[PDB]
Structure formats: structure tokens, C-alpha cells
Design an enzyme around this catalytic site. Structure first.
Site, short mmCIF file in Angstrom:
data_model
loop_
_atom_site.label_atom_id
_atom_site.label_comp_id
_atom_site.label_asym_id
_atom_site.label_seq_id
_atom_site.Cartn_x
_atom_site.Cartn_y
_atom_site.Cartn_z
N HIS A 55 -15.46 -23.09 -62.49
CA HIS A 55 -15.72 -22.69 -63.40
C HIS A 55 -15.32 -21.36 -64.11
O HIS A 55 -15.62 -20.40 -65.06
CB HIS A 55 -17.37 -21.77 -62.72
CG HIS A 55 -16.91 -20.78 -61.27
ND1 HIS A 55 -16.70 -21.49 -59.95
CD2 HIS A 55 -15.84 -19.99 -61.36
CE1 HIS A 55 -16.25 -20.32 -59.62
NE2 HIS A 55 -16.31 -19.07 -59.64
N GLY A 108 -12.48 -11.88 -57.39
CA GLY A 108 -11.26 -12.71 -57.92
C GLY A 108 -10.63 -13.64 -57.07
O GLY A 108 -9.90 -13.47 -56.55
N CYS A 136 -12.62 -16.26 -55.87
CA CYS A 136 -12.43 -17.65 -56.11
C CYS A 136 -11.34 -18.41 -56.32
O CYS A 136 -9.99 -17.71 -56.70
CB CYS A 136 -13.26 -17.90 -57.18
SG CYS A 136 -15.09 -16.65 -57.05
C1 LIG Z 1 -15.51 -15.71 -58.39
O1 LIG Z 1 -15.45 -16.96 -59.74
C2 LIG Z 1 -14.32 -14.82 -58.80
O2 LIG Z 1 -13.43 -14.88 -58.55
N1 LIG Z 1 -14.09 -14.66 -60.69
C3 LIG Z 1 -12.91 -14.24 -61.03
C4 LIG Z 1 -13.38 -12.56 -61.10
C5 LIG Z 1 -12.77 -13.22 -62.03
C6 LIG Z 1 -16.89 -15.34 -58.75
C7 LIG Z 1 -16.59 -14.54 -57.10
C8 LIG Z 1 -17.53 -13.60 -56.51
C9 LIG Z 1 -17.17 -13.71 -54.45
N2 LIG Z 1 -17.51 -16.68 -57.98
C10 LIG Z 1 -18.56 -15.89 -58.99
O3 LIG Z 1 -18.46 -15.86 -60.24
C11 LIG Z 1 -20.29 -16.72 -59.32
C12 LIG Z 1 -20.47 -18.35 -59.76
C13 LIG Z 1 -20.81 -19.61 -59.80
C14 LIG Z 1 -21.88 -19.50 -59.38
C15 LIG Z 1 -22.49 -18.93 -61.39
C16 LIG Z 1 -21.21 -17.65 -60.67
C17 LIG Z 1 -21.62 -16.09 -60.18
N3 LIG Z 1 -20.24 -16.38 -58.98
C18 LIG Z 1 -21.57 -15.27 -57.41
O4 LIG Z 1 -21.06 -15.58 -56.70
C19 LIG Z 1 -22.22 -14.85 -58.22
N4 LIG Z 1 -23.74 -14.92 -57.31
C20 LIG Z 1 -24.70 -15.11 -58.09
O5 LIG Z 1 -24.85 -15.87 -58.64
C21 LIG Z 1 -25.59 -16.23 -56.99
N5 LIG Z 1 -26.86 -15.92 -58.04
C22 LIG Z 1 -28.21 -15.83 -57.32
O6 LIG Z 1 -28.62 -16.10 -55.93
C23 LIG Z 1 -29.72 -15.82 -57.45
C24 LIG Z 1 -28.94 -16.08 -59.49
N6 LIG Z 1 -29.76 -15.45 -60.20
C25 LIG Z 1 -31.00 -15.17 -60.01
C26 LIG Z 1 -31.42 -14.89 -58.87
N7 LIG Z 1 -30.26 -15.48 -57.71
C27 LIG Z 1 -25.79 -17.49 -56.52
C28 LIG Z 1 -26.17 -17.78 -55.26
C29 LIG Z 1 -25.73 -19.53 -54.39
C30 LIG Z 1 -25.50 -20.20 -56.33
C31 LIG Z 1 -24.68 -19.66 -56.91
C32 LIG Z 1 -24.16 -18.28 -56.86
C33 LIG Z 1 -22.30 -13.22 -57.94
C34 LIG Z 1 -23.26 -12.53 -58.51
C35 LIG Z 1 -21.02 -12.94 -58.85
C36 LIG Z 1 -21.74 -12.15 -56.30
#
Ligand SMILES: *[C@](O)(C(=O)NC1CC1)[C@H](CCC)NC(=O)[C@@H]1[C@H]2CCC[C@H]2CN1C(=O)[C@@H](NC(=O)[C@@H](NC(=O)c1cnccn1)C1CCCCC1)C(C)(C)C
Ligand SMILES: *[C@](O)(C(=O)NC1CC1)[C@H](CCC)NC(=O)[C@@H]1[C@H]2CCC[C@H]2CN1C(=O)[C@@H](NC(=O)[C@@H](NC(=O)c1cnccn1)C1CCCCC1)C(C)(C)C
Lengths: 304, 304
Positions: free
Chosen positions: B41, B143, B145
């Protein structure tokens, strides 16, 4: 988000650990530059421990009585001195893997990472606090002596602890890297009471801020208190007095959450007077006191 | 003696962490030999996350779209492939600091060390367990990930976890190093329930053995039970069923303490039915389930 008892990455320390043998006693040393540091009781027999004269025992030793072993390769000991309760063994090779480092004495309630070692081999890393009574609740087996405690302050390893001994309560004592014991202890096999252990109040407030930051808010209340009245309640539950210096050092967590230190103090008063009523905070049933304000800021802002 | 949540020394992993940037997304990769592994991603915009076709998105990328940065020095990306939910970026340099390593998938209730990283810089190490519902209760900021989970099995680093995402409960999900999610999760921004979380019964029994080994014995009782009747009580308190394989793997702790697994099971039944009555075990008010039988044996016998 989430909140964990997190230790410093231990790589910079793992490259400084050696095995020190003198007679049939083998423990760990810290090999910085051209000096191996270890507990001076490496020179003692089991009989010596009852009442050692370390000066007389050290004078009977020669440089060749010490085996310093960096992994496989034997270091040549070219000189030995005693600094308080640590030996400094000069060797014929400066450690290439020597990082940038300071020796620091920490204060009661500051936290550090322990690299537990056996035979100069790093086996495990955990985080703990210097208790107010200057003991640590570590995990140390026979052979762990000379394992070190440290902080990493922006690529500078601050060494604060060398392991010397275990008290009958199963708590641990040892020295800074200049050989001074934390607490009233001496490296001799006699009865030596640790003080009364108190709860590190400033650390509990840091962790309650960590809980708010992570959406655990149930314990927040409309009440406020003075520092005096809080300290009156604190002292009764064997909590450390909270000082203005503590309130200051909590300021940044206060700012970020917008909850005044004395408002948070009012939440902790009610918790202490009433218990948690079968609730938890960051999944704990007990109030946690092994995170400093700076640990909470580090982990919840994410410094590397 | 003493008992701590202990992580593996992280040095062998710290030397494999790099920064991976694609567009304005920067996270962490694992640089083993001539491959950098990271969450796929990294290629997505915030709009892509809603419903990504990772094959179409990856085909639009070239080797030069990826900045891989080992400390200061930029690696040259010479090839990119997708394995399940991880990218493998081929680079022009094999990592000298590459340790001996395997990729391993762990099972629900096994434990591992997480090296939390930001911008390819290791910031912290902690121990946790794969929950029965295949989430982890980590500590991860924006950050984080690509941070990895690992065990050290006698100088061989077994990589078991790469961090991908955080669920709204504040729990964490990600993959093995072949890119398969633990649990029913997919790398897309939709609602995805974790299962019911259960207590890891075998781990609780391991920790009760750790308590006995450390002289906490108050919870031992004269009662015994069958595996069936224990599992009847277990299931009611949302504990994992205990299997004969669990009883076997507890055998060594049973042998060392001379308390049969089913006798210890009887102690845990009474704890569950009656609570702790304001007592603690190894200073905890709650039963701990993030130590495997092998963790307790390791820490209480002291392997390096
Ligand atoms: C990671 O990619 C990172 O460190 N990126 C660097 C800063 C640029 C990051 C780290 C967070 C601990 N993770 C993400 O960005 C992931 C990816 C994978 C799924 C898409 C994005 C979102 N994500 C998240 O961790 C998010 N969580 C969610 O989007 C969850 N959403 C929901 O529960 C949900 C969504 N739509 C409607 C209702 N509820 C889901 C839950 C489990 C399935 C996949 C993610 C955030 C919001 C960033 C915590
Ligand atoms: C360490 O040297 C080591 O790893 N050595 C390698 C294996 C060869 C070893 C590590 C244990 C965690 N430490 C010791 O051997 C130290 C040194 C320093 C004091 C003399 C010995 C004893 N020692 C201990 O840790 C012991 N603890 C004690 O002797 C305590 N004894 C008492 O509380 C006491 C003594 N006499 C009467 C009544 N009570 C005291 C308590 C605090 C003052 C110093 C040590 C053992 C028994 C090994 C845990």
C-alpha cells in the site's frame, strides 16, 4: 496508537558486551574504547563475599588472571584498576563497535532499558524504573552480573546501570558505571534492607495522560485539587510526594491533552480513594508507574 | 529471579531496516540480501485505499518511482514484484549486515519481538503475542508500517510479522513476510471486524508456572480436574480451549515444578470462578497470557 512497555533498540550495546572470567567466576563486562568494565566481586571466592577487603584481593591479582573474551577472540588484559565497586580492565584493542556514549547517574523513578546477558551473549531486553528505594525489579539469573542499563539519547548511549546482586525479596541492586551503588547497598553477603518502596506518582500521572491520549477517559472527573491536598492523599497510599518540578515536567502532556496537571491529580486522588471498581486503564487493573513523562511523549510522538 | 516481558535483542534486525518512499508515502522496509520487503500500500494514494486494484497500480510504477534509503546512502531499485500484500524491491547492493534468517508464519498465541521503526530508524523494541483473533496489541504511530516482528532462534532471525494497519479498537494487523495477512483482513480502507478475542489459556498456565518458579504459590490448591471439565469452565470465561498438544508443551514446566498440568489447571479454574480477592501474581492483578511455555523456560533457564 496503543501503549507498550518499550525498551531502546539494543544493537549499540550488544556490540560492547564481553565475557570476563577471573578464577572460576565468569560474568559480563562492558567493552568501551580500551576499557572493560565489570563488577569487582568477579575477584571474590564464595568465602571472600562474607567480608571482602577488595583492595587486598585486587593486589593479589595480575593482568593475566583475567580472561576477557569478545565473542570468540580473547582480549589481552594490559592493566587493571578499581573504581568504587567496578573493575576497569585495560585491553590491547579498542572496540571498533564502541558507539558514542556517556556515563550518567539516573534519579529515583527514571526508566532505562536493561540488556540481560549471560557469558557476554545478549539474551533479552526489557524496560524498568529505578524504584524510589533504589532497587530495580529486573529479571536476572546466575551469570547476569555486569548486564547494563541504558538510554539512547539521539544516537548517544547513556549507560546508567550495571547489575551486581539480588536481594531476598527477588529485587535487584547494582551501580552506575563509575561503581557507586544505587541505594544503601554494599557488595558483601550480609542482610541489607531496601527502604520502603513507594509508587512513582509523577510516572502514574504520565501514564494516565498516555491513557487519555489513547481514548481511555472514564477516570476523568470535574474535581480539581491543590498540590498540598493531593500530596496529603498520596502519602497515605505510599505514593512519592509530587513536587512543582514534577508538575513542570508533566506540562507538555498537560498542553497536548488540555488537562491541567492538578485536574489529572484529582482523577488519581479519586482512583486511590475509591479503587477502579473492576475497570482497567490501558488494559491494566493496577496503576502503572514505570513510564516517565518523557517516555509517554517519546512513544506517543514517536522519536527514533 | 524476577519475571519481565522481555524482547529479543534487536541488533540483527536494526541492520536490515530501511526507508521506502513512493510518491509522498514513506514507510519502512526490511533489506535482506538483494531484496527490500515493504507493505504494498506504499504505492496507494488516500483515494486508492478505498478500493485499490494493486496489480493495475503496480503496473503504472517504475523501479525509479521507489526511493530505498539505507541510513544516508540511497539504494538503486533494479526490479519490483508483488507477493500477496508485500512488495519485493530488488536493489543493486546485498546488505552486508544481513544476518542468518528464515521467514516463518506463527500461530495464534505465539509471541514475538516488534522493532517499531519510523523513516527506517529503529525507535523501540517490545514483546507481544499473536491474539487468537490474529490481531496484535502493538504500539504503532503513523509511519510505523513495515516495522517487523521476529524471534531469534540461536543466531537465526525468524521474521514472522510486518505491520500494515490499525483497526478502530486501536489493535493492529499485518502479514507474514510472504505477504499473507494474519486473520481475515485485507489492505483496503473498509470495515473489517476482528473475531472475538479469547484469553490464551496455555500462556496463562505457562505464567502461573513462572509465578511458582518465582515463589508466588498462594493460588496452588489441593484440587485437580479433567481437561474436559477445565475446558467447560475455560469456554465460559472466553479462554481458548486447552488441547493435549498444549498439555504436552507445558510438560517441561510441569517437570521442573513437579505440579501436573491438570493440577495447575485446577488452580486457574478456582482463580477464574472466584477472582484473585485483591491479591496479585508476579505483581499483576490480571492473569497474563503473552508468555508461551518456551518464553517461561527461556527466561527462567536463561538461553542467550
Ligand atoms: C502505514 O501505512 C504507515 O505507517 N504509513 C506511513 C505514514 C505514511 C499506516 C500506519 C498506521 C498504524 N497504515 C495505513 O495507512 C493503513 C492502510 C491499510 C488499509 C488502508 C490504510 C488504512 N490504514 C490504517 O491503518 C487505518 N485504519 C483503517 O482504515 C481501518 N478502517 C476501518 O476500520 C474502517 C474503514 N472504513 C469504514 C469503517 N471502518 C481498517 C480496519 C481493518 C481493515 C483495514 C484497515 C488508519 C485510519 C490510518 C488507522
Ligand atoms: C553475579 O555476581 C553473577 O552473575 N555471578 C556469576 C555467576 C557467577 C550474581 C548474580 C545474581 C543475580 N550476584 C552475586 O553473586 C551477588 C554478590 C554481591 C553480594 C555478595 C554476592 C551475593 N550476590 C547475590 O546476588 C546474592 N544475594 C545476597 O547475598 C543478598 N543476601 C542477603 O540478603 C542476606 C545475606 N546474609 C544474610 C541475610 N541476608 C544481599 C542483599 C543485598 C546486599 C548484597 C547481597 C544471591 C544469594 C546470589 C542472590
Amino acid at each position: 496508537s496503543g501503549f507498550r512497555k518499550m525498551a531502546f533498540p539494543s544493537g549499540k550495546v550488544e556490540g560492547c558486551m564481553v565475557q570476563v572470567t577471573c578464577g572460576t567466576t565468569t560474568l559480563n563486562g562492558l567493552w568501551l574504547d580500551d576499557v572493560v568494565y565489570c563488577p569487582r566481586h568477579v575477584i571474590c571466592t564464595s568465602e571472600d563475599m562474607l567480608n571482602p577487603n577488595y583492595e587486598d584481593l585486587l593486589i593479589r591479582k595480575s593482568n593475566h588472571n583475567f580472561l576477557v573474551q569478545a565473542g570468540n577472540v580473547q582480549l589481552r588484559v594490559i592493566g587493571h584498576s578499581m573504581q568504587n565497586c567496578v573493575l576497569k580492565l585495560k585491553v590491547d584493542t579498542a572496540n571498533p563497535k564502541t558507539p558514542k556514549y556517556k556515563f550518567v547517574r539516573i534519579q529515583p523513578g527514571q526508566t532505562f532499558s536493561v540488556l540481560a546477558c549471560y557469558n557476554g551473549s545478549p539474551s533479552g531486553v526489557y524496560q524498568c524504573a529505578m524504584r524510589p528505594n533504589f532497587t530495580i525489579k529486573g529479571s536476572f539469573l546466575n551469570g547476569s552480573c555486569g548486564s547494563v542499563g541504558f538510554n539512547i539519547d539521539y544516537d548517544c548511549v547513556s549507560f546508567c546501570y550495571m547489575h551486581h546482586m539480588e536481594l531476598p525479596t527477588g529485587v535487584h541492586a547494582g551501580t552506575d558505571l563509575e561503581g557507586n551503588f544505587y541505594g544503601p547497598f554494599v557488595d558483601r553477603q550480609t542482610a541489607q534492607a531496601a527502604g520502603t518502596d513507594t509508587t512513582i506518582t509523577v510516572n502514574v500521572l504520565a501514564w494516565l495522560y498516555a491513557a487519555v491520549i489513547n481514548g481511555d477517559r472514564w477516570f476523568l472527573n470535574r474535581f480539581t485539587t491543590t498540590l498540598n491536598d493531593f500530596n496529603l492523599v498520596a502519602m497515605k497510599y505510599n505514593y512519592e510526594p509530587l513536587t512543582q518540578d514534577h508538575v513542570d515536567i508533566l506540562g507538555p502532556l498537560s498542553a497536548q491533552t488540555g488537562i491541567a496537571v492538578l485536574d489529572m491529580c484529582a482523577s488519581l486522588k479519586e482512583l486511590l480513594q475509591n479503587g477502579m471498581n473492576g475497570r482497567t486503564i490501558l488494559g491494566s487493573a493496577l496503576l502503572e508507574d514505570e513510564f516517565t513523562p518523557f517516555d509517554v511523549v517519546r512513544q506517543c510522538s514517536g522519536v527514533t
